[PDB]
Structure 1
């Protein structure tokens, strides 16, 4: 039905919100500290000296273990 299409779009958008904002390919699993923006995978987060959301300096990256995490 048309509701199947609406729900597929909602699911796609929620899943996209959990993917890295830089590479768009891997799940978010890293927080920039101390600002707290949690928007990147570990690979993109390691390459940024400044937060890509607020531009605060990244003192270090904290790995986050989230219940929504998925794998092959």
Structure 2
């Protein structure tokens, strides 16, 4: 029904929000510290000097293990 289409859209959007903001292909699994923005996969987070969301200096990257991980 149309309701099934609405739910498919909600699911799609939530899944897309879990993907890296740079490559759009791999799941987010890295946090820029100390700001806390958690928006990249490990590869894309590796060479950024400053956060791509807030411009704060990246002192280090913390790997995150999330219950939503499926890749």
Q: Which interval holds the TM-score relative to the shorter structure? A: over 0.9
**DSSP-derived class of the 1:61 partner:** strand
CA-CA distance at 1:47 after TM superposition: 1.9
> Deviation digits for residues 26-68 of structure 1, max 9, x if unmatched?
0000000000000000000002110000000000000000011
Structure 2's unaligned 5+ residue stretches are none
| Aligned pairs for 1:1-72 within 5 A | 1-71=1-71
2:47, 2:18 → 1: CA distance?
19
Local SS of the residue matching 2:28: coil
Show structure 1 runs of 4+ deviating over 3 A: none
Mapped to 2, the partners of 1:54 and 1:67 lie a distance apart of 26
| Distance in 2 (alpha carbons) for counterparts of 1:47 and 1:25 | 18
Unaligned regions of 5+ residues in structure 1, if any?
none
